[PDB]
Write a protein that binds this ligand. Structure first.
Ligand SMILES: O=c1ccn([C@H]2C[C@H](O)[C@@H](COP(=O)(O)CP(=O)(O)OP(=O)(O)O)O2)c(=O)[nH]1
Length: 483
């Protein structure tokens, strides 16, 4: 009511689409913020760095199994993994030995149900793109999960209209009606859990803790030392972070901020703390130096989050059924391929940003073994290789002969960024990267079946007339090999 015609059009639009009401309430709130000209900037003058945290390696103590019976595991399955040029679900790529990401997860859940807590709950966050494939995979590979897939496993992600930069109205593309919508970031999970009523369901069913992570990350597995830690320190929201390195200067960082509880009564000294998240887009042009200074801001979000659900539900109800979160303003056109299509805004939230929205919240430093996404085919190769190994609880860990360090793989992105070409590289077989510090492939190359490599291994093809084919059983140590 009393909303600008622009907003009113969006409501009307989403109504006809039969869009969940929790999404419309949330999105309009976000639409208003933008319309009022909220910059969304997070300057250094508004924040202080975080310098000390508990480490996961230091905790020894495991929780009892009764805890795990009220735990929910939720993976994010929205991504298409187009970065490797794949038009279906990313989690469905083979990782090791005919097993996909979705395989290792399902097998890990299986372990916990049998050997620890049978009441453990598994859920998935699917986009419209990933829903069918995910269901079809489970129907063949994991019946029990499929059986309930529709009923309590699958949580569908919402879609939100792209608004015109020019009038903030819902964009209209007659060529492709589907391009009028966009996913609202992975922070939509909260809005999805509320409107679907599945938050209310779980809590009523006596489910307290939930662990959320990215599907493409095989580092993220349940660790009972984290659950015990939360119970002991009464934490409602725990964000796993790894250390920010030279490579991570582009990535966002964990920071802290101050508000005050009402009144100045008590000892007039002690302050408050809130933990927030700052993406690069939120940082102003002037503060970009410190932002990339990893000695000041030393931690980044691994997106492995443990949440206390009843508290989470309570919090949303205080704010009228939604969870306010900082809104990234995505500047695009309605059809990304068309440069001359109408310029639009896409409003997106991050799931890690909610940390600042909880009274009892914290951040724990985990080893980078717990942050292992496969963004590229180079990363995909490492896992196929014998450098890694599958455990009896179905974890993926680095073989002991690597002595803690995983083989760096450089692939020529002209040929190998695409999974298509990449498969041709490994077509005849797979090499042994366990003893290989660094491997590099330039130009067009195809591997022999059973080869092995040690130390620095460079493979260069400048000719690029056909492909340099490695002999079977060939061995390369601290060398470059061209034809
Ligand atoms: O909105 C989301 C975003 C991510 N993911 C999952 C899938 C991802 O593995 C992960 C984070 O992906 P991102 O950094 O967001 C990248 P991007 O989603 O642009 O990727 P593709 O273009 O789809 O390939 O969480 C979701 O389930 N929902």
């Amino acid at each position: 009511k009393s909303l600008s015609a622009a907003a009113q059009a969006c409501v009307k639009k989403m109504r006809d689409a039969k869009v969940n009401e929790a999404c419309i309430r949330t999105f309009i709130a976000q639409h208003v913020m933008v319309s009022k000209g909220e910059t969304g900037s997070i300057p250094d003058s508004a924040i202080m760095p975080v310098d000390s945290l508990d480490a996961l390696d230091s905790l020894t103590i495991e929780c009892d199994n009764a805890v795990l019976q009220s735990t929910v595991v939720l993976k994010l399955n929205g991504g298409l993994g187009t970065g490797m040029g794949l038009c279906d679900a990313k989690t469905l790529l083979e990782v090791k030995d005919g097993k996909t990401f979705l395989d290792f997860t399902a097998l890990q859940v299986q372990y916990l149900r049998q050997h620890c807590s049978e009441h453990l709950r598994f859920m998935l966050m699917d986009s419209f793109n990933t829903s069918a494939s995910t269901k079809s995979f489970l129907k063949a590979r994991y019946p029990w999960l499929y059986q309930v897939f529709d009923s309590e496993v699958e949580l569908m992600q919402n879609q939100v209209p792209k608004i015109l930069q020019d009038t903030l109205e819902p964009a209209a593309w007659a060529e492709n009606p589907a391009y009028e919508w966009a996913p609202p970031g992975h922070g939509d999970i909260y809005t999805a859990l509320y409107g679907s009523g599945k938050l209310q369901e779980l809590v009523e069913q006596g489910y307290r803790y939930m662990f959320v992570s990215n599907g493409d990350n095989l580092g993220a597995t349940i660790d009972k030392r984290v659950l015990a830690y939360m119970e002991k320190e009464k934490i409602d929201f725990l964000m796993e972070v790894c250390r920010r390195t030279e490579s991570d200067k582009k990535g966002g960082h964990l920071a802290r901020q101050t508000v005050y509880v009402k009144g100045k009564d008590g000892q007039p000294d002690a302050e408050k703390r809130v933990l927030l998240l700052r993406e690069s887009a939120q940082c102003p042009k002037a503060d970009m130096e410190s932002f990339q200074d990893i000695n000041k801001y030393s931690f980044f979000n691994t997106n492995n989050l443990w949440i206390r659900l009843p508290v989470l539900l309570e919090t949303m109800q205080e704010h009228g059924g939604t969870l306010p979160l900082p809104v990234i303003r995505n500047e695009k056109t309605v059809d990304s391929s068309n440069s001359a299509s109408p310029k639009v805004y896409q409003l997106e939230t991050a799931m890690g940003a909610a940390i600042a929205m909880f009274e009892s919240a914290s951040a724990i430093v985990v080893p980078r073994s717990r942050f292992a996404p496969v963004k590229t085919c180079a990363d995909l190769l490492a896992l196929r290789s014998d450098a890694y190994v599958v455990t009896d609880d179905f974890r993926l860990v680095l073989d002991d002969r690597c002595h803690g360090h995983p083989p760096v793989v450089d692939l020529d992105s002209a040929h190998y960024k695409m999974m298509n070409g990449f498969e041709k590289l490994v077509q005849h077989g797979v090499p042994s990267l366990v003893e290989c510090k660094r491997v590099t492939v330039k130009g067009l190359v195809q591997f022999g079946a059973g080869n092995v490599l040690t130390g620095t291994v460079t493979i260069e093809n400048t000719d690029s007339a056909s492909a340099f084919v490695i002999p079977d059983g060939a061995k390369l140590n601290d060398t470059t090999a061209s034809p």
